[PDB]
Design a protein around this motif. Sequence first.
Motif, mmCIF file in Angstrom:
data_model
loop_
_atom_site.group_PDB
_atom_site.id
_atom_site.type_symbol
_atom_site.label_atom_id
_atom_site.label_comp_id
_atom_site.label_asym_id
_atom_site.label_seq_id
_atom_site.Cartn_x
_atom_site.Cartn_y
_atom_site.Cartn_z
ATOM 1 N N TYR A 141 0.830 -1.201 0.000
ATOM 2 C CA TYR A 141 0.000 0.000 0.000
ATOM 3 C C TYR A 141 0.861 1.247 0.000
ATOM 4 N N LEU A 142 1.908 1.258 0.834
ATOM 5 C CA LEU A 142 2.712 2.468 1.002
ATOM 6 C C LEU A 142 3.644 2.699 -0.161
ATOM 7 N N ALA A 143 4.115 1.624 -0.795
ATOM 8 C CA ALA A 143 4.925 1.756 -1.989
ATOM 9 C C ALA A 143 4.149 2.477 -3.100
ATOM 10 N N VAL A 144 2.893 2.094 -3.319
ATOM 11 C CA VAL A 144 2.092 2.736 -4.365
ATOM 12 C C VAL A 144 1.878 4.197 -4.014
ATOM 13 N N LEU A 145 1.637 4.463 -2.735
ATOM 14 C CA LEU A 145 1.393 5.814 -2.257
ATOM 15 C C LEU A 145 2.622 6.686 -2.443
ATOM 16 N N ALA A 146 3.810 6.121 -2.213
ATOM 17 C CA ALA A 146 5.063 6.851 -2.367
ATOM 18 C C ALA A 146 5.455 7.038 -3.840
ATOM 19 N N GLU A 147 5.157 6.069 -4.693
ATOM 20 C CA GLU A 147 5.714 6.072 -6.034
ATOM 21 C C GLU A 147 4.822 6.784 -7.054
ATOM 22 N N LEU A 191 12.457 8.325 -2.590
ATOM 23 C CA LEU A 191 13.024 8.169 -1.256
ATOM 24 C C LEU A 191 12.112 7.329 -0.350
ATOM 25 N N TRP A 192 10.823 7.688 -0.267
ATOM 26 C CA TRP A 192 9.930 6.956 0.625
ATOM 27 C C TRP A 192 9.653 5.543 0.129
ATOM 28 N N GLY A 193 9.537 5.341 -1.203
ATOM 29 C CA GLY A 193 9.350 3.993 -1.707
ATOM 30 C C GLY A 193 10.545 3.106 -1.408
ATOM 31 N N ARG A 194 11.745 3.688 -1.405
ATOM 32 C CA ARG A 194 12.950 2.943 -1.089
ATOM 33 C C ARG A 194 13.090 2.688 0.417
ATOM 34 N N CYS A 195 12.690 3.646 1.259
ATOM 35 C CA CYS A 195 12.605 3.402 2.695
ATOM 36 C C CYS A 195 11.642 2.259 3.000
ATOM 37 N N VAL A 196 10.475 2.252 2.356
ATOM 38 C CA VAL A 196 9.560 1.136 2.537
ATOM 39 C C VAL A 196 10.245 -0.157 2.127
ATOM 40 N N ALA A 197 10.913 -0.157 0.972
ATOM 41 C CA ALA A 197 11.655 -1.336 0.546
ATOM 42 C C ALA A 197 12.634 -1.799 1.626
ATOM 43 N N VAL A 198 13.310 -0.863 2.293
ATOM 44 C CA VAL A 198 14.281 -1.280 3.296
ATOM 45 C C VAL A 198 13.584 -1.965 4.470
ATOM 46 N N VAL A 199 12.428 -1.450 4.894
ATOM 47 C CA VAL A 199 11.697 -2.085 5.989
ATOM 48 C C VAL A 199 11.280 -3.495 5.584
ATOM 49 N N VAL A 200 10.827 -3.659 4.329
ATOM 50 C CA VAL A 200 10.418 -4.962 3.809
ATOM 51 C C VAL A 200 11.599 -5.943 3.784
HETATM 52 C C1 LIG Z 1 8.901 3.533 5.915
HETATM 53 C C2 LIG Z 1 7.544 3.708 6.593
HETATM 54 C C3 LIG Z 1 6.927 5.073 6.241
HETATM 55 C C4 LIG Z 1 6.497 5.159 4.772
HETATM 56 C C5 LIG Z 1 5.573 6.365 4.527
HETATM 57 C C6 LIG Z 1 5.213 6.455 3.039
HETATM 58 C C7 LIG Z 1 4.363 7.692 2.754
HETATM 59 C C8 LIG Z 1 4.696 8.271 1.381
HETATM 60 C C9 LIG Z 1 4.202 9.712 1.290
HETATM 61 O O1 LIG Z 1 4.682 10.319 0.112
#
Ligand SMILES: CCCCCCCCCO
Lengths: 106, 106, 103, 103, 103, 103
Positions: free
Chosen positions: E24-30, E65-74
């Motif tokens: 969910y968050l990857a799509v939101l970030a990307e 940046l945020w999609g890659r941070c999510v990737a790191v948590v995954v």
């Molecule tokens: C790594 C956990 C926080 C990810 C938040 C993603 C929100 C993206 C907003 O542009």
Amino acid sequence: DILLTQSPAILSVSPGERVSFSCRASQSIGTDIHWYQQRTNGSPRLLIKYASESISGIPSRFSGSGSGTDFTLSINSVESEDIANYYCQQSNRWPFTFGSGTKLEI
Amino acid sequence: DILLTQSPAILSVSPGERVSFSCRASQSIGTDIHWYQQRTNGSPRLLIKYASESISGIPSRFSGSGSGTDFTLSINSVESEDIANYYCQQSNRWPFTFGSGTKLEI
Amino acid sequence: SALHWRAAGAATVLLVIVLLAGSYLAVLAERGAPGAQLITYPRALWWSVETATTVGYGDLAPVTLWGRCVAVVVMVAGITSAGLVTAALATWFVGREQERRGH
Amino acid sequence: SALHWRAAGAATVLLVIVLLAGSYLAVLAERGAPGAQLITYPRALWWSVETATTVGYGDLAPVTLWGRCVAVVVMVAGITSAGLVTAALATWFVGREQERRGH
Amino acid sequence: SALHWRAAGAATVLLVIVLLAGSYLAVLAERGAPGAQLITYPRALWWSVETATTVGYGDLAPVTLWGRCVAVVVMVAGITSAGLVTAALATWFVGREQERRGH
Amino acid sequence: SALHWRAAGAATVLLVIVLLAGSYLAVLAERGAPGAQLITYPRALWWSVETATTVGYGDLAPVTLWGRCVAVVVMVAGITSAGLVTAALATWFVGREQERRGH
Ligand SMILES: CCCCCCCCCO
Ligand SMILES: CCCCCCCCCCCCCC(=O)O[C@@H](CO)COC(=O)CCCCCCCC
Ligand SMILES: CCCCCCCCCCCCCC(=O)O[C@@H](CO)COC(=O)CCCCCCCC
Ligand SMILES: CCCCCCCCCCCCCC(=O)O[C@@H](CO)COC(=O)CCCCCCCC
Ligand SMILES: CCCCCCCCCCCCCC(=O)O[C@@H](CO)COC(=O)CCCCCCCC
Ligand SMILES: CCCCCCCCCO
Ligand SMILES: CCCCCCCCCO
Ligand SMILES: CCCCCCCCCO
Ligand SMILES: [K+]
Ligand SMILES: [K+]
Ligand SMILES: [K+]
Ligand SMILES: [K+]
Ligand SMILES: [K+]
Ligand SMILES: [K+]
């Protein structure tokens, strides 16, 4: 090396119209394109980084778009002080390269 | 198989000018291109390896540039002994292939 | 504290240092090689993380000898870290099972 | 010395041998297959390392049956090595925790 | 139940949650980054699984940046899960070998 | 024999079965999807091995829902196998260190 094609070399617009500068990369480079303005006898000035990101101090009528190979710098409603040469530059692969420039004429 | 296009087939220069030989690969091959010189009735001689790397014993007026699909062999200030045929060769994919050669004429 | 936890924390710290140092050194090694993409620091840091975790999407990869040596140090730091943590976890679980069964 | 450390060092030595032998054999297997890129030794050694660590960027990969069999031996040597080292680490931590608690 | 099995099951549950939340968050970030492909949920869920297992084919990867941070948590959730399970397996085998030898 | 060795051998056998069955099922799932490359058995077997080891070069990858589900079973069988073997190795090393120290 990445070849950047800016065509046409001269753009002629009327005051207050929207103008679009084209920059095409010889292969796909994501959004790694940056745009500079150079006025007569001036040094280049960064306008837009990473294809679409704003720079502080640059008027908001400047914007950029595109990804892959095709990039566009846009000016909403051109005015006299926009008269200048406009260059794109890629940073996706070494070495960094520049396009050959488009002159804005009003 | 990688096709290497060398065009033009004949280059005509004046003594002491800078000359550039073009070699274009049918697909991207990084920097895996090597350049050979062959004089009349002589065997080929490696000039430049991996697009830009010097070979010991080769005069420094030879250099190479490029990556991807587009490669250039350059001679700073050509002289008579540079009269020869010039070949590029790729080693990125099997089989190794050669370009068709550019003749230098002064 | 216990040795396995000290070793795991040490390894996490060293890993962070290896990721940052490797990102810096990758850019230093790869600039100057025509075609290289590992040439700006933010995406080099991302590359170092996906190399340390052994994910390796292949969106970025080094082409020079030194950039690839740096990559090898990053891989080994990441795999060693993960091994250290697994071993520390095993040690914790083994000791708690010893106690739960009465030694 | 203790068995787990001897086994880990052995496995590191064997891994280095597998990387070098696999690089040589990959080139030998892949030359002669049109399109193959695993055909010069320096980049084949790099490929063997990123295969052993299971990173697999995909900048290089074998296309022949024998080149892929070599790849499988390299993967298994790398995964086994990493497993051996993790297990040796676990054994060390478990023994030191036994002593620290008084057996 | 024993701690290592509770920890393994917990980690499997948390991993499933991380995969779904990360998709969910990857799509939101990307979405909003020109060129991004991690922008619909079914293939984002697939990407999160092949990232957690550290396979990383490279058919999909984040660019922001945020999609890659999510990737790191995954990645870290996946590697930690796998480490937790290995350690729980080790604990089970060690205890059963203790009993089989008579402690 | 001891449980950890029986479990490791079992897991190796099951893994071989998962690789073969997954290759067959991947082709069955992916034929009929325009663009799919995982559609002949020899290269599907190769893909299943580099997926099980978590290498994932990305030369091949599934595009359908069922082909990706098969991929997930293959990843998990490979990671579990490798975890089982690491744990069996740890159990062997721990027991031999117990004996070498006199219990
Ligand atoms: C790594 C956990 C926080 C990810 C938040 C993603 C929100 C993206 C907003 O542009
Ligand atoms: C010597 C310097 C080394 C350190 C470099 C500093 C990097 C700064 C990152 C933040 C700036 C954002 C710019 C940007 O647009 O970044 C993302 C792309 O949009 C790139 O994604 C990334 O930077 C990936 C982040 C990876 C997280 C790693 C966490 C480790 C546990
Ligand atoms: C039978 C022969 C097998 C051994 C082959 C010998 C390889 C020689 C490497 C040094 C020459 C440099 C040429 C060159 O330009 O190399 C790099 C590309 O520029 C390639 O990167 C590489 O060679 C990758 C190095 C990987 C390090 C592996 C360390 C293992 C822990
Ligand atoms: C907030 C929402 C997050 C969850 C998203 C829901 C995804 C729904 C999947 C089913 C719909 C099928 C549509 C389709 O065509 O899917 C496949 C391509 O054809 C894509 O392959 C995939 O969806 C990959 C499945 C990965 C399985 C993960 C199992 C984890 C152990
Ligand atoms: C239901 C059938 C499932 C089994 C399929 C049978 C595959 C037969 C392989 C041998 C025929 C060679 C044809 C060919 O040209 O193969 C290689 C490419 O040239 C492909 O490389 C491969 O087949 C990869 C081999 C991977 C080895 C896996 C070992 C597991 C430990
Ligand atoms: C592997 C640690 C040493 C890396 C040094 C990189 C310096 C590059 C100079 O070209
Ligand atoms: C997997 C170990 C044997 C590899 C032999 C490679 C020889 C290739 C001959 O074509
Ligand atoms: C994941 C195990 C079940 C796979 C079944 C594949 C059948 C594909 C039919 O389209
Ligand atoms: K991988
Ligand atoms: K991996
Ligand atoms: K990979
Ligand atoms: K990949
Ligand atoms: K690719
Ligand atoms: K592992």
